Amino acid sequence: GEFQRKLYKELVKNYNPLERPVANDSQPLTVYFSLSLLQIMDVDEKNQVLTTNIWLQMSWTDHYLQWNVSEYPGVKTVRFPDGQIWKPDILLYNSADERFDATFHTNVLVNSSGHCQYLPPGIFKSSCYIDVRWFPFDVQHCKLKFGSWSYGGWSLDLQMQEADISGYIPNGEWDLVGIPGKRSERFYECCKEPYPDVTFTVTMRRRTLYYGLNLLIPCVLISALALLVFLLPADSGEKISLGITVLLSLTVFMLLVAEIMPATSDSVPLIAQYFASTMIIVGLSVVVTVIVLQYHHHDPDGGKMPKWTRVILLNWCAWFLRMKRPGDPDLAKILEEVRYIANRFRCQDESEAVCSEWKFAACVVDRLCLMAFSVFTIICTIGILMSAPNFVEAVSKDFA
Amino acid sequence: GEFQRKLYKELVKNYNPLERPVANDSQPLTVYFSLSLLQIMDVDEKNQVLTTNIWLQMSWTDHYLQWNVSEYPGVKTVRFPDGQIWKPDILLYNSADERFDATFHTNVLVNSSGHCQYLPPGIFKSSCYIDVRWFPFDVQHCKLKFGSWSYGGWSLDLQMQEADISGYIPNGEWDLVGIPGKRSERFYECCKEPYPDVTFTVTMRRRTLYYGLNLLIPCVLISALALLVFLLPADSGEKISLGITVLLSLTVFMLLVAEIMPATSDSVPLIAQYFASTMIIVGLSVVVTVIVLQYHHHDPDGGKMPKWTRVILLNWCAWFLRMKRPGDPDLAKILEEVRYIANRFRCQDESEAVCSEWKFAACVVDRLCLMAFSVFTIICTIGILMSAPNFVEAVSKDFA
Amino acid sequence: GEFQRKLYKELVKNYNPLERPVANDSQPLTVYFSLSLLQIMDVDEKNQVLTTNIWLQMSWTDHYLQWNVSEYPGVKTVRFPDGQIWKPDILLYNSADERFDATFHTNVLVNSSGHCQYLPPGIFKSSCYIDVRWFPFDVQHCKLKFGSWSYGGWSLDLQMQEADISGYIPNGEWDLVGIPGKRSERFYECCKEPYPDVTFTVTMRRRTLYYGLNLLIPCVLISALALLVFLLPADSGEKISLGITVLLSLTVFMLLVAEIMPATSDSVPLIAQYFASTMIIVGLSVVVTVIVLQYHHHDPDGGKMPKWTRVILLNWCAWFLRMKRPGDPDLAKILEEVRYIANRFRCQDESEAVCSEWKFAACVVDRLCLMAFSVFTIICTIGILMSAPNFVEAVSKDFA
Amino acid sequence: GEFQRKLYKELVKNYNPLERPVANDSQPLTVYFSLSLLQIMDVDEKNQVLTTNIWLQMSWTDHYLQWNVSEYPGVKTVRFPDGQIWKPDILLYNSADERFDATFHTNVLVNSSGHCQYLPPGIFKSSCYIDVRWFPFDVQHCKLKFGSWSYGGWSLDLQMQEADISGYIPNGEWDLVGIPGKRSERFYECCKEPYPDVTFTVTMRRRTLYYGLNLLIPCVLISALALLVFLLPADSGEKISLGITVLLSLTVFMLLVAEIMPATSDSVPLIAQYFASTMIIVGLSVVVTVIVLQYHHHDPDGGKMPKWTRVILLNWCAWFLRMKRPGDPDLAKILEEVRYIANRFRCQDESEAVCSEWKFAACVVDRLCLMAFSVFTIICTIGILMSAPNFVEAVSKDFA
Amino acid sequence: GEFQRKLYKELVKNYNPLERPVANDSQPLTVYFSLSLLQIMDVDEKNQVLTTNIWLQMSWTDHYLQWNVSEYPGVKTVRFPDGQIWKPDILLYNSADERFDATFHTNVLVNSSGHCQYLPPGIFKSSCYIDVRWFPFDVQHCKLKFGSWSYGGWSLDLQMQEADISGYIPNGEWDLVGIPGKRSERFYECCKEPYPDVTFTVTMRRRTLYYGLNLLIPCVLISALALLVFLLPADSGEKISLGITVLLSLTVFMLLVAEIMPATSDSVPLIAQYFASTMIIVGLSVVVTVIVLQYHHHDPDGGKMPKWTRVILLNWCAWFLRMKRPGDPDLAKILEEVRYIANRFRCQDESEAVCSEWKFAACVVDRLCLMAFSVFTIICTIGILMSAPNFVEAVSKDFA
Ligand SMILES: *[C@@H]1O[C@H](CO)[C@@H](O[C@@H]2O[C@H](CO)[C@@H](O)[C@H](O)[C@H]2NC(C)=O)[C@H](O)[C@H]1NC(C)=O
Numbered sequence A, B, C, D, E: 001g002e003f004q005r006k007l008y009k010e011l012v013k014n015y016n017p018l019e020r021p022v023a024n025d026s027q028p029l030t031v032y033f034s035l036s037l038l039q040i041m042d043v044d045e046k047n048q049v050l051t052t053n054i055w056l057q058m059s060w061t062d063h064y065l066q067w068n069v070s071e072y073p074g075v076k077t078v079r080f081p082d083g084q085i086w087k088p089d090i091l092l093y094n095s096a097d098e099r100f101d102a103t104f105h106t107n108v109l110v111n112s113s114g115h116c117q118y119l120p121p122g123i124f125k126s127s128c129y130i131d132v133r134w135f136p137f138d139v140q141h142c143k144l145k146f147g148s149w150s151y152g153g154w155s156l157d158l159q160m161q162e163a164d165i166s167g168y169i170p171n172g173e174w175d176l177v178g179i180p181g182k183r184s185e186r187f188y189e190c191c192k193e194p195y196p197d198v199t200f201t202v203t204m205r206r207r208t209l210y211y212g213l214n215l216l217i218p219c220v221l222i223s224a225l226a227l228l229v230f231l232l233p234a235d236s237g238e239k240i241s242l243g244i245t246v247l248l249s250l251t252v253f254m255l256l257v258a259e260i261m262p263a264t265s266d267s268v269p270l271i272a273q274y275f276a277s278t279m280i281i282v283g284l285s286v287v288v289t290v291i292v293l294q295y296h297h298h299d300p301d302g303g304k305m306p307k308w309t310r311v312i313l314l315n316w317c318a319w320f321l322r323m324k325r326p327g328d329p330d331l332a333k334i335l336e337e338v339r340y341i342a343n344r345f346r347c348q349d350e351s352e353a354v355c356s357e358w359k360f361a362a363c364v365v366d367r368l369c370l371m372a373f374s375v376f377t378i379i380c381t382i383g384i385l386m387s388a389p390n391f392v393e394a395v396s397k398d399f400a
């Protein structure tokens, strides 16, 4: 209308977008900076980058953009695009975007008394340190640092307002704990003037149902299956096959898991410890299987069983496991022939008795190692899983 | 021509692109917002992003862009590029694009009576929640929220018009159900003025022929092949090999499937349940194979068969399956030699009879477990597949 | 020079870039639109996107950009950059680029009589439907739709000119058949005015030497190798290993092939049919191997061979394959001892004869199944390959 | 200073950036175009794209940008940014970048006598044909075509100057041979005026140490290991396992290699030929192993050895390889019993002799096939490797 | 305020952004260039690209931007955006970004006496040579070259100031050693004037805990497991399976490692040497296993053991390893029958004695090869690992 056109013509008269709009040049300009979190788009553990969708909030008073509503009866607010009025140069310090500024420039809404509002949206990429020590039961704190680039503390007085999470849309992987803020002043090597900044810290908890169902349970099941090599009889040549195939599958699982993790050397991750323990156990099982097979296929003429191993294996472990322990000239010529045949048969029987003793010793060793390996696997798995903090509360919140 | 040049010169006189074109400054400006869907370019389940190709539709009346056709006989419409006339600042709220605005700015067509048209095209990326609970038989609702950024309800009266799908090009993977719209007003923490918005919801159904042919059928076939381990005779040492290789292939299949799914913890997907059931069944089959091999390679001197297992296995299950149950001094010296030989042979025969009994018991156990595992596999597969809603209608629409 | 400077100063006087340059405002402006294909950069089967490098061609007459060559003796043509003269707003409708316009804006060459030329280059991404039903023997038609966005049929009369392929650079994977064009008018829900457009269709044929050498031949070789399981004697426990390892390799091959194909449900691809047939054949071979091993390791005391299977296997199939079918008190005491020994030996001989008969039956079954499986594999492979159209001409053009 | 400010004010007076700066409008303007190669950033065999870092060089004389140094004692050169003076519109024709122009616009340095210099840097992506016929011993020629877009031969006289490689930084994978240039004129369907262009051809040689160490050597080693199947005795059932596992590893190697190569059908690559030959050899080895196992596990009652194969295998090949060729009523009743026992033993001995003969024939066949396969593998590998040109010089330059 | 507005109006009067702000046109302008490192975002070994987050520092005196503070009591500094005042055109020479300039343009802070400050941030991608000869124990020097593009040494006197690392944020993978700088002048083929530049070299050390835990340790464990093939008895056909499966796993590990390394031919990496040595050792182990199996399954009728191998194997190696070395007419008719039976048994015993001797020789060979292979593996691993420089200090800093 006529009043709106006249007001727009009058307001921009003699207006300089380069000038800080303060009545007194010696006084700082107060700007209220806040934030409005809308969504956590992505958390990149490998690249250490957090992607969020937020709305920035800025507010200040303009001394020159004031008018009397009586003279312009219908006009209450005006809007100015980029490059026509003064705006703060507030940037995100720890940006990880190929172009530093990610905000989308929009209009600035103005009171009839000079109050200005500026709420630019955008997709913000920031570089925050991600700790994988307790993965997948980890809680991450990622910081967002904002502040004016070229305005010091004597010119632009930055103030903080609490972040808004009313329109937050929950994520299926991360659980938001809170987003507190802090305002502080710092000194830089450039200049002798303090530069205030506002830092917002996003605290998020990882939901562990997916990882527990897709990584931890299959590893437990395969490790338990690797213990079946101690129930197979040695007469079936299928023990090394079982052990080695299980080991190969677990190595594949290590590779799949490590393809998603950062190559940091700060600490050893919990899942890395778990995989190392499982693989060491499986390798020891393969070694024990080799020893048991060596005992089973023992040549009777190779050598007598040592007294110590014989007594311990055939008495103490047998008692402990309640093992069952098995166990005219023509006439003379024919006589010596049948005597030779009978003696040969008796020697064969003695050799088979020795072989049976060796096989029983192998079975006893195998059963003992089964018990020991099962106990060790259970203890190691439980201890490694329970070592992590907030594991119990993660289980309670996710599964129960 | 002369008339066109004169009209273009006259129209831009005293025109301010910052001013809302209303005759009365106290009245809202009515803008009709609609949509025109052209193609569903991509649906990203892992990143929760929907990519579509749409044309926006805007329409409003400009009070200053009016002229009499008699004075300009040949001129009926005029066009203005970006930055020369007022346009609404309508944006997509839930944008997932690195730059917030994705529209391509084009000309604005104007009546001889002030009516304006604006139809910018673009490739729009939006973040919509994708539910994989019933994958691959899922139906997705993705919302597109539009609204003016800096104009309230007292300034810009946003109205809704039904979306146009006349030029829609069908997608080979997703089946469009409909795109209804809804207009609503909301309050924001910024201001005390309502801000209307228009939301369009895209309902799409996944076509399941590809997934059924590439994932579900091979898993069924491999699981059925895993049941062949109960038909192999134990004398051939090739049962553990079959079982473990099938298990390894199925684990590879899990990894391939999980590489395409989001890491959400909202619920357990149907395909995840199916894979878990199949893998548990195969592992139990391997355990049963170990037990059967243990029974088959039984030492006759190890211990007598327990009475309970002997009677049950050799009577009840045999009846149930109609199993066939198998079954001068020189003369004295020669006499004792041949007596010893005959006694040795008789003892060997008795031992072989005991071994045959053990082998028959192993065969009976193996057949019983074959029947039980087959029934269980069929029941679990059918139940898991039928649990999903609209599974029957998906099958009817895709395969039949 | 002086004349060039004077002409440039005079031409831009009173010139409005917003005005359509026609002497009569009531008449349409004729614009000739053509195309110049230079290269087919990429064809994306998974994303349904075609990337090409083309030069657009536009031509029209400007009424205001005319001068007499006599007054400017050396000046014959002038050039104007973007934003200084009127240009048509011709766009690609089915664009798949994140920014809708992909042309690079260049100068406009002008006659001394007003004729204008505009040839912007660019890399164009368009969304065209790609049919994988006959892959890898498929021929694709991808359409490129061009037209003015905001100029109707009463203002801009779009005309078509045949595309130029003189500078086309052949691609090593796709064979160009032709690029015809078509001009048509359409009505839109926006307005009551027809909007002409020019559509160019690119017909391309896939060169199949690479795919035939890298996919089809290895599958044939591995499937043929899977038939070797019927030549291995059953005494060597290495049949299940062969069959299952071949099956695992073929499954890996399925995964590799499916990683490059779209997840469409329009139809079942030819290569998918081929893989399904091969895998079904291999699985049936494994089942037959299990049955043969069951027959070979038959307990003689298990049960007599059924009469029907005995007669058929030992007579009819043996004839068909010309199979070779194998086949004082002390004296009394010693007498009964040796009688017992001889009777035991005779019983052993009878049992071994029964076992030999069972083994021969297993061999006959194995040979029969070898013949049947070989014939079936050959027939299925040949039929599936020959089902595709233009397969013969593809083979002739690529291999021969 | 004052002189610099005055000169800058005076130079831009009446200056038109659209006007070609020539004293005579009828004469062409001479522009010297050269190049300065700095780095070869990437060579994309799969996408047929070359990425380089170069500096363009342009030079021309401006008639209007001249002044007397005496009047401006301290000023010798001036600089003008983009859009303030005339510049040639020289573009790269065969660009593969999503935006056609990749140069970074910088200042233009000007003499006191009008000579202008323009050296824009940039990262240039160009589409050049890459031939993989002799990979990894290939030499590639990639062309870079430059020329003015809208200036013909009667307006802009493009001249060529030799490229500069003084600041070239060597690449660890490609060896630069040279970069010659050529200037030529072409006619286009647009217009009846020739358009000169300058083409630079980059000749590069691939350094083959990495590929030879990572691809060729492991394949040779695994193929040689596959020949160990002819040294394993048949009594150990571990021949099919060796052969099939080697075949599976080689197939994995094919997949890894083919994941990096273009899907072109121009010709069959050398590495593809090598892999095909190795795989055919391994498959033939598996077939021979099946035949040898069939011979070894021969039933003595199956049938007499054919005379021809018997004589050839047991005489000619044995001689050739110097093979060692192995090799009262009660009394009557007891008499017939022991006669029966002895006759049974004699028949068993005869059967075992026949089996030994069959086993020796199998061993002879196995040794013969070992020799033949070793010779064939060596010959094929050497011939395929030596077929490629410049293979000897590549080996000499890389390894020695 | 009024003073700020008046000063801003007065300062821009007659100001030309194209003019170098020096009082005397014949004198160079001194510019101080420094750097401020904030983070090392990424180091790309495969693409030879380093990504860092730095702040540039520039400082110079402007002769025209001076004023008296008394006349403007409250104003002490002013800020000017891009394109309104003169700025140096300092660029990064070895940029690897698709657009050459990566800095984000910000305001320029100005003294009341003319001193100017300019600190643009940005994400910088540079192409630096990365040496993988000692990977994963490598130290990398990557250079960042800065300098004015179009200003020579007679116009812009570039000076260097030491880099600032106060706000550096440590990286979890790379350890910063230091960032020294160097200023030098160079001549270019363009012109006869020297062009100074400032080069900063970033020295970084890789933290090796992650790589040592994920690559080196599993390889050592698997190589040690491959030595178990010399403890398995030959009677269990599970030696070739163990060896070949270990070899296949190691080949997979090679592929995983090589997927992350550049394809350079400068030198052979340490990890490549380690993998080659391990694979050669495993292959030799497989060959030795084949030989041992050949000795074990020796036909007694094949041929007498050669005297030399017999004496050496059964005496010298047995002594060295303390190996245990095992070891009326009717009456006449019955007489010859039992004589024949006894002679057959004696011949069988002699054959079994010969076979036992061969088996013992095989065991001796196997034990000898076990010892030799273990020693060789240990020596090769230790030597290859210790060959790298700073390996000891890397271990001390990371693990201890
Ligand atoms: C103008 O720039 C060019 C090169 O920078 C110079 O002109 C050359 O001067 C040399 C002698 O010094 C001649 O041999 C060449 O023939 C000239 N080149 C051309 C294309 O003519 C010259 O230094 C500069 N002119 C002034 C006044 O500085």
Ligand SMILES: *[C@@H]1O[C@H](CO)[C@@H](O)[C@H](O)[C@H]1NC(C)=O
Pocket: D024, D025, D026, D027
């Ligand atoms: C320009 O060149 C032509 C011949 O090429 C000549 O006739 C004409 O006189 C020249 N113009 C001037 C002003 O000298």
